[PDB]
Symmetry: D3
Subunit: 253 residues, 6 copies
């Protein structure tokens, strides 16, 4: 039950990932075997809620790729249910300040370190009580990644970085540039500068920087700056671009 993604970050080994906007456990498995270090379960139209995350985690389980799940916000209930279904690494959206970061962390840890409920029923997280000493071991294997999406969050980064249990800080270029006044234009120099310096700052604090970047050369640049969890594509972009390129090779006839 050791979290290998968390251990890799801690050891400074960079992890290359793919963002999943589809909810299918079939495509999840198809992608789990494609050679990524991690996959981000982030679908915005999931049909079966936590059960959708269950089947994606089951699909991914036997593969080397590690799952990370993005709840739709920093929601203590959502977090509790994702941890019970067996999620060990979370990407928590819209973390704006250190208080919010500390709340995300506390939601993942049993008392006294946090407020995670032991609950009434057996859960997949403990493999139905088959993992020996699960209660004692669980806290140390939770990996909390916080997403910074605004000027305000960027402003508060040194304090967020000071929060114990924040293992990583993920920057979403699209949302940040929108908030900076360049929506759709993350490549604008002021935006790239802010991202580069955040990535360096996170790394210098002994925490893992993450980012999503579909431009392959930019991704490489972030990796050199020390980004340790880098999503380099999104499943639905891969599919849409491949399909469009294929149809264009023939034109509509």
């Amino acid at each position: 039950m050791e979290n290998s993604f968390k251990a890799a970050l801690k050891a400074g080994r960079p992890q290359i990932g793919l963002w999943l906007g589809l909810s299918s456990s079939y495509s999840a498995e198809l992608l789990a075997g494609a050679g990524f270090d991690w996959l981000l379960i982030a679908g915005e139209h999931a049909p079966n809620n936590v059960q959708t995350v269950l089947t994606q985690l089951q699909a991914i389980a036997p593969y080397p790729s590690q799952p990370v799940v993005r709840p739709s916000w920093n929601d203590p209930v959502q977090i509790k249910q994702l941890l019970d279904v067996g999620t060990q690494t979370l990407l928590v959206p819209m973390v704006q300040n250190a208080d919010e970061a500390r709340e995300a962390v506390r939601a993942t840890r049993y008392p006294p370190a946090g407020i995670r409920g032991v609950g009434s029923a057996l859960a997949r997280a403990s493999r139905w009580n088959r993992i020996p000493d699960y209660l004692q071991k669980a806290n140390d294997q939770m990996c909390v990644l916080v997403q910074i999406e605004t000027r305000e969050a960027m402003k508060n980064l040194p304090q967020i970085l000071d929060v114990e249990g924040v293992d990583g800080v993920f920057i979403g270029p699209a949302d940040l540039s929108a908030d900076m006044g360049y929506a759709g234009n993350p490549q604008h120099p002021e935006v790239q500068a802010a991202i580069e310096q955040a990535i360096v700052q996170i790394r210098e604090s002994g925490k893992a920087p993450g980012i999503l970047i579909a431009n392959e050369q930019l991704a490489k640049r972030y990796l050199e700056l020390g980004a340790l969890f880098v999503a380099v594509g999104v499943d639905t972009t891969l599919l849409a671009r491949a399909a469009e390129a294929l149809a264009a090779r023939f034109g509509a006839q």
Copy 2:
């Protein structure tokens, strides 16, 4: 990607609608072809969440009837996901004051006009980036309808009507009469008076009034007073009343 429902309201053409309490994309399509101007996706037992709204929007898409979606409350996350799946007209429940109305509006608009996230993945809203200049065009095509359900909301109507981006104000007779002390008795004169004068007041402010009314003559009355989005029935009422009337024609034998 022009919102024809929003344009019709703006132009003062009244829109006749049906409330959908069933979640089926099959019944949605069956109803989409029945000749209504708009359909309200408002099911309270939807199985597949945003994915349920996806399949209803897909069912309705080729028909003249326009979809409006009612999130279960004024929930920034819910709103973001409904807009990403392609919803352009929202009916936001339990708007009690102008602050809440302004928050609903801001949730639907990209920065700087609002807080809508550009997000990380392609979305159905932009048809996966196939709508040219989607980011630049989206804000103007969002249509926000706010639902007033209480004495407090009715009290605050002049201020709600003053909120930029509130395109329409919908009155729910059942809930309002309950709050006024006549639960189940919306036909009580004091209640009808409050509704009539709200409808006139909304219209006089240059905004669209909406209401749900299953009594055909009352519906016509509201339309004369200037109501511009009037739901005249509910799918599950149509079905239950038709079935009961049919069985009664034969009696149990």
Copy 3:
């Protein structure tokens, strides 16, 4: 675990029904409380297969309306699964001759009366072995209705009527009229005559005639001639026509 629909037919009490083309257990429950004697689970776009039938049966269970299920054909494996999930009355499509009617009957009965498998797991049908003596009681509570849809089936009707275990014979006017040369027009006198003569003949043999008919006058006509399970409308027709009429009043 008495099959009350089956007993009503046997007693000559007519049963007024509604055909369900939607698969939803929510609409099934909404309709189960509307006053019909029976509901026909016949959806052609069901999402969950036997599981969808399970939730419709569960929805209907506490109401007076009795369920009847139409498998998509006379498929012994489909019939086995529907019986295991708890179906006791089947409307079996496209029964063309006495051999096919006998196969449908044998599919519903445990040996030696039929080929129904006792199976390996507990099943909802026996309420997980909570119905005492289920294996011994089950056969007599199965109710098999065969659907006649072609001129060929009409020709073989006398033989079908001689099949023991056939409790009912259901006539589908639209398909029959198409087979007869009047697709879309069951109102033709030749179609009506075949239908009405069949009803008389079925009842004469001591079996239940059934039919789907959305025209109230024709429905009362068939009832007068002795029909015992008459489906008088379809859920999706009710909804579509009510919606269309409503929108029209504001147009």
Copy 4:
């Protein structure tokens, strides 16, 4: 539409229950016939949300066992939708103080006694308006059970017990012992003492105590102390323990 579970509690007849962590309406029905007085719909990975609760309520309806539903928190929207789908007894999690208890109660009652919305569409709760005078009868048949899971909640118990409409108070041993500093060790004397005295205190206030306890002798002890809704097992524990015991009788061969 009389709530027989609520009436049994009121009359002091103890109700023996099973906690359902599976969401299947098939297993729900299989368990509904097993001889329990009540079943707790509490699955943490439900696929179809309110629709999942619909099919479980439909499965259970013809059986003597009575359904109770645990929303994932004291969420006015969640509560409204569960009541509309026909839930009459709720177990509300994480009630910490009397204000929260009063809010849970008010969420279940139509105005003026509460804030429950009459709503726009017919609902399963009224059996689509077929229950005569439903609006007038509904409030009295709602049964609110509040879950106390912390030292803070235990501290506030006398005030929670003073709230009109709180019919019962449920103690979750696992969560309480975790909060007391004995996570995984509810059998610790100080914890058992706190639970025993809460059970007596609830009962002495004329309200129903509830608890979940899988140890059969401990369960009997709580029943003697006056606990009136006692869940004595969890479906997924029954299955996991039975399967493990069976495989062990043969060993892997």
Copy 5:
């Protein structure tokens, strides 16, 4: 309710397509807007059966791309349900001889041209009776494509080509090459020769040749020889290969 795919084939306009192995209506819509003339609904793990086909058809409806559905075999009941949910072009698997091709055609046509049942309930196919004269117009808008997958089917090709109502003949290179002794290697000259000769022969008879081929050069070769419905890739191959190439660039 004109079948535009069918008219294009008839007019000799080639149609470039994509094969869908995923069942999602979200990915179906994402692909429907990518520029193909047609999409083949062929998923082998569909969750909701006919209902899954319903949501894919609904997703695709407003786009220029035309849907074609592949039932899992030449199953009259499966074909009836797909037609009722609104399918107008079918790719029918494992058609081995002219008798099987005729059965597939008759399954799609109302009497007296075929055995398609008019049915009891309204269906999406007629848009719930909103398409005027649907019963009279439907037969001529059905488009039947038969899939040839074996040496036996190739031997009977001349006869299959004589079946009225067969609008198209689809060659599946992987299965044919396996039947011929080269499983996994359609590139063998003997396989290519059989494929190319068949294409010429099909077009010669005034029917549309079709084929799935992910190799662009071969695809252009078949088009040059007169193929009219060419599926040039599969959704799951596109995704798997793009994902794998992407991960590799960072390895």
Copy 6:
């Protein structure tokens, strides 16, 4: 992609199993970690068809327990789809004679050994072509178990045992005892004798005998006689009986 269940049978190592009547991938995973050598995916009310099998296989994949899937009958199309989604061991129902056993075997093997279609799309079975030489390795890792359920099948057992590719013969006591005249009572000496003689005979031919038996003593008896895949309980029986016993202790 070694089939480890198949190798265990071949090596004469007995495999203790559990029959799954529930379809849930959550309960499938909960049971996959309970200690069984194999689990039988046999649900009769599955909601998602092949997709439901996909999520159960995915749930089970990382555990030591090996999955075996029971198609609802000896249906080549059903077998094709289950193999494509990744099933390597099939329990094929109602195999009555050697011809039917051979058909089941040929359905699982690529030409020229069988009729399994290579197909058009990538499939989970080959892990989307990530298993090297999958087409060449697949046939030898398929494991076909035939279910004998009638006196007729018992009569033909010697011939069935001569079919190459039949790795195992599974006896279903409830169905056999019903066919023999003792429905509900497999305990009868005549039934037990037929079962035990069959087990000896199967093992003698160098094939694996299998059986479902919830009685521990009988299970050990069959194991002693040489049975190699013994399912010793059903998930829904375990749950129902545990729940009932629990409620009873408080009654």
